[PDB]
Amino acid sequence: LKASSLRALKLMHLATSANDDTDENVIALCHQAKTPVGTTDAIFIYPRFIPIARKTLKEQGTPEIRICTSTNFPHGNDDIDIALAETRAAIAYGADGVAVVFPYRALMAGNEQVGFDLVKACKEACAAANVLLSVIIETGELKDEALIRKASEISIKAGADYIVTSTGKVAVGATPESARIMMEVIRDMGVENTVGFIPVGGVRTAEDAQKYLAIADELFGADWADARHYAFGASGSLLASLLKAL
């Protein structure tokens, strides 16, 4: 568990636990990302806190820690104008990465077009600003393998730089099963170089993290899951469990 734990710590997007948030909590999160035995790849926070986070990260000597944030979140509504405006604002605040929630309920109702157009609009804005676009498909709500594959496919076709299981705000988050399905889509579409994978809302222990990294290594080889291709979107419990294991 030591090997997977250190690797997982470095791949974390250490996420706020707010629904809520304050400067004080975000500053604490920045400090927590500089762990006693390694530094996480990123933090994940609400957009309005990006400027204060950037300053905090610089002043503790870790300007390399990326700042990711959320849009169309957590509900994954259909409205592209709103999702796009939120994405443009996240970019203006200074985000390194934006995770947009796919309109998964629309897909569940049979509408494949809205998700394509919503992701594509957000990707165009992000790409222009050198911001990576993650797409959260909400596997715990989609539930069905065919729908999980379809949402992944549409997101990839529309330009997702990562596909992400979950918001962490619904009853069911990542499972090793949904992770496997999504990673198989990345392989089958031939986009393993351009699309990463992020489990959210199902990795709480070192033992969990080991299992998820094992899937990546099994499917793509041990060298694939670097920061550009893999992240753990998770909070303090996972981080504490990783540090304990270490």
CSV table of C-alpha atoms in Angstrom, one decimal, residues 4 11 14 47 73 97 123 131 147 219-220:
chain,number,residue,atom,x,y,z
A,4,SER,CA,0.2,3.1,-4.5
A,11,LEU,CA,-2.0,12.6,-8.3
A,14,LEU,CA,-7.3,18.0,-3.2
A,47,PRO,CA,-14.2,29.6,-8.8
A,73,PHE,CA,-22.1,22.3,-11.0
A,97,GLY,CA,-8.6,23.5,-15.1
A,123,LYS,CA,-13.8,23.3,-24.6
A,131,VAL,CA,-7.1,25.7,-19.5
A,147,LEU,CA,-25.2,5.3,-20.7
A,219,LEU,CA,-5.3,-1.2,-19.0
A,220,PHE,CA,-2.6,1.3,-20.1
